[PDB]
């Protein structure tokens, strides 16, 4: 199911260069999607994390939790990627029934979390069609997948670049 | 049996009963014919026409507009007709979106306006996207999906966004 | 005579009619806490929330100046005002029903009494009143400037007047008049 | 002093014109230093009589066109900007006080403040077209994307006159169109 | 010696109390607003108004050496609320140095007292900071990281100066079914 | 000295070097009109060169502002990317959509980037093609000896904080 799905996304990304050192990855993710009760869906965010916490180690890059819209799409990061130039703390604690499940998880496993109200990140996952390009540096571009689904939740995979711009004499080599 | 009319046409009768559509707001269209089919660019522009006609009938009976996305090559630069353009809140920028270069329904929408304008970037209450293209960087904060029993136009995935207020307070605050 | 404060507030109002406080269109923020009027209770804070804003509505109509009631820190200082004042370039509104404990006794009561409220995250505005040292500051239009009043409290809390006006720019040479 | 640049000003200003450059509604810029009108230091009365002059010419301009015009301060007010009170957004502009005199302000915008109906001043502006007589600089208040506009007449007596427009930025890739 | 005594005892007083309730974090900037008027509680003139500033300046840095606080001073309207601060806190991504020597009657006794006796001050037009303390409603919001909170403390004046303490923290967020803890 | 516009801005370097213009660590923005200069890549070539030699004595580096068809995007080196102050745009400039200075910038630099927008202490422009959007505010035109180079009317500019208070402020 889910697990074989997400193993192969993830090996298939790396792959591609999708992950980058220094990068934060921005999830957007409903679990209930990807079987199609909060015992359950915890079970499926701690595999999520825990697969997304392997490529963290083997590829430097780093990963942002979105929460629901209930607690108005606020990001869950550790606070060692906080930076109050760009982000903003804001106070709430992800819950199963306000946060979803997978933010509720990171929140309590990561070593130091902190919420911010918006994030601006190179690129991002939503599994269940959460949204995230909110989140994504302009200009957010659509990745190609072999992997179109994780269970029965259809995945998005975006990344970034900048703007194209020039009239019709510009050279872009 | 026009490509996508029928589930177009079923999405948006639902859309309406829902109240999605509000007099006033602009709605954010989101597409890519070719994933409503699953080639060339007389089908493609057929379809963007089937697309852009659904709308304008919505349009008429809810008082809504529209703006329609520009593909990535065209930095998702947003066309829109000079009565909804803002400039307080809006930047005008000089493309033309081209079949191949800001995609069928944005050329096709570009053509058929009254005053076509081009801007960077726009914030509005809700919007459509056919076929994964995404438009959450276009909708207020904060973006809410919108469940629909229509799942597809054609081929094509479809995702619906509305946009409701930050919800604040602390753990005593009162919503009602 | 009736009322907590009363006679304090009406002199206050009186003296900032008397020196062209309350501008026609103008916005005024205020910053209340009612415990401060009294000393330190739902039934008597409410009670001192009604008269403030029935208070400052007769002013409204006077001089055609609008209020805005700042909500306490546990709602982030978010503000109630008419969504005939809501101007969506300038202010973002957030959803949140100012409650006693959630908000203050005079939020509360504004909003309760108010034709159509809204409540917005932040503003800017060219004056404010803070009874009972909320602090206002935040929210007046650069530069702020105090203003004096003989009448320094409403009851036992004391009263600040903030006004704005235009920061003053030049070097050494630069001309006022 | 009365008569200096009257003629050169006079033409660039016909030839601006007819190029459609003062549009209904716009508001235009303009930096100027009157000492460079004249090529040297000159005193206040000098000085103001050519300020007399451009505001004169600007005006007759104003009536004919219904542009209105903005003028930028010396760098000892910030560069802060006077403009009629009719002209003032608050959604996009910051009064800030000060009177322009000719020894902080400059003697345009001196003159400009003294002769406006109801004059304030501007902390920032951004407006879609401007003048700058004499390299005073005024490209930091045109509209992104600031275009200089190629002109027959070069120079207001000794000052060399620089003339911008603007329009949108040109965006997409190698395949965009543009037409 | 008279404008050399006033506020001392009431202002390391509050110190003390601040301190006790943590409110002076290491490395935090907190922003005074002063009137030595106030403080004194009528006119008075150049030499003793700088008299009490001295005695304020000194006091908060000794509060700054035990804590490692730094303080920032707002200086009056007349120079619009520009607020004196030593370089070495000044950061260009957030702060725009303006142009302006604070003086007794274009600045304010203490933001003169301050720029002439610190290391290297520069002047900034506006600052967001964690916390500040205003003797003699001077008014400080305008200058404290949302969320603003005011500090309740048991020493209410310093002289005859009101004094009002803010500290800040996030914006909570979320609806009725969020968690806080 | 024969190469077009060498001599006088040659001249104009150590005129602005002896006004302490150029400071370790700054940014200096040029604007450049080639043609201006002579009445176009050779142009480019000794006034990027000269630059250069600028740069390694001064420790200032340039940024290069390019024409209005590619929006007067700038050209700098990545070293002086910062992301938090300045967005990377994808275009390459040309003779024809950028002008000289810039293409010849671009293909000379170690690791070219194009920003939209920048935010420096000082710049020199070279032809009129305007540069004061770029100049930190308060931008405040520098006085040369040199007045052209080769046929190109020369701008210099540099900055300095807002004076700020009423009549009653002082500034010493």
């Given at each position: 199911?889910?697990?074989?799905?997400?193993?192969?996304?993830?090996?298939?990304l790396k792959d591609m260069?999708?992950?980058?050192?220094?990068?934060?990855?921005?999830?957007?993710?409903?679990?209930?999607?990807?079987?199609?009760?909060?015992?359950?869906?915890?079970?499926?965010?701690?595999?999520?994390?825990?697969?997304?916490?392997?490529?963290?180690?083997?590829?430097?890059?780093?990963?942002?939790?979105?929460?629901?819209?209930?607690?108005?799409?606020?990001?869950?990061?550790?606070?060692?990627?906080?930076?109050?130039?760009?982000?903003?703390?804001?106070?709430?604690v992800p819950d199963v029934?306000?946060?979803?499940?997978?933010?509720?998880?990171?929140?309590?496993?990561?070593?130091?979390?902190?919420?911010?109200?918006?994030?601006?990140?190179?690129?991002?996952?939503?599994?269940?069609?959460?949204?995230?390009?909110?989140?994504?540096?302009?200009?957010?571009?659509?990745?190609?997948?072999?992997?179109?689904?994780?269970?029965?939740?259809?995945?998005?995979?975006?990344?970034?670049?900048?703007?194209?711009?020039?009239?019709?004499?510009?050279?872009?080599?």
């Amino acid at each position: 199911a889910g697990f074989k799905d997400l193993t192969m996304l993830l090996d298939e990304l790396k792959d591609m260069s999708f992950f980058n050192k220094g990068d934060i990855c921005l999830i957007g993710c409903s679990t209930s999607e990807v079987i199609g009760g909060t015992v359950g869906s915890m079970e499926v965010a701690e595999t999520i994390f825990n697969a997304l916490d392997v490529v963290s180690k083997e590829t430097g890059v780093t990963f942002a939790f979105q929460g629901c819209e209930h607690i108005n799409r606020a990001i869950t990061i550790e606070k060692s990627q906080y930076n109050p130039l760009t982000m903003e703390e804001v106070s709430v604690v992800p819950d199963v029934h306000a946060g979803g499940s997978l933010a509720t998880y990171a929140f309590q496993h990561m070593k130091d979390p902190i919420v911010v109200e918006h994030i601006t990140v190179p690129c991002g996952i939503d599994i269940g069609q959460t949204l995230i390009g909110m989140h994504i540096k302009h200009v957010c571009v659509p990745v190609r997948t072999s992997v179109k689904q994780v269970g029965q939740a259809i995945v998005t995979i975006a990344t970034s670049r900048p703007k194209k711009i020039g009239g019709e004499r510009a050279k872009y080599q």
